[PDB]
């Protein structure tokens, strides 16, 4: 039948003009011990690596 | 339940009083034996309408 999206991956990735964007890890908790530079540099979105792009494409066929 | 007394009872009342009793009392002792009747509009109207005078004359 129709291909089905992996909803867990759909909640983690979004599509840009030429690729996919994602959030950065290690910013959920245990934040007091982290330096200010890590705190502000782990904030925001980055791009999905070319090695994982193919897997993301198989997991999210319509985005 | 709500019951009107056809015949006098020691403490519930005397000769036609309406009063509230527990369900089991009326269901198992009064209504089968004919010492009372439930407080429906039809039964109550029949109580005052015709049989009131006959019941009063049948005091004993």
């Amino acid at each position: 039948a129709k291909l089905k999206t992996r909803r867990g991956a759909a909640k983690r990735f979004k599509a840009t003009a030429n690729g996919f964007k994602r959030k950065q890890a290690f910013k959920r908790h245990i934040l007091t011990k982290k330096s200010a530079k890590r705190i502000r540099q782990l904030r925001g979105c980055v791009m999905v690596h070319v090695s994982d792009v193919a897997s993301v494409r198989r997991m999210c066929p319509y985005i | 339940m709500d019951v009107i007394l056809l015949q006098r009872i020691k403490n519930l009342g005397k000769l036609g009083d309406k009063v509230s009793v527990k369900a089991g009392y009326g269901r198992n002792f009064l209504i089968p034996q004919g010492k009372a009747v439930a407080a429906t509009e039809a039964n109550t109207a029949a109580f005052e309408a015709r049989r009131a005078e006959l019941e009063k004359q049948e005091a004993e």
Partner: protein, 77 residues
């Protein structure tokens, strides 16, 4: 069978649900029992197998009305 003559209630099925959310088949049973009612118009005692909700309906509507209704459905009482 465990059927109420006045309301038609009967056992139903359901689940036991544990704290770990294990599910097991179970039954819910009616509060059934036998009771004798004085039928004045016939001067006799009538024995019925019914629930407590059936008793509440009998208190609300009168025994003779319920008996006529049951006889209207082909029940031999």
């Amino acid at each position: 069978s465990k059927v109420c003559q006045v309301t038609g209630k009967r056992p139903v099925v359901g689940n036991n649900v544990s704290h770990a959310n294990n599910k097991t088949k179970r039954r819910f049973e009616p509060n059934l029992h036998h009771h004798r009612f004085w039928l004045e118009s016939e001067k006799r005692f009538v024995r019925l197998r019914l629930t407590t909700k059936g008793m509440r309906i009998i208190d609300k509507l009168g025994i003779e009305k319920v008996v006529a209704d049951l006889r209207a459905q082909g029940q031999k009482i």
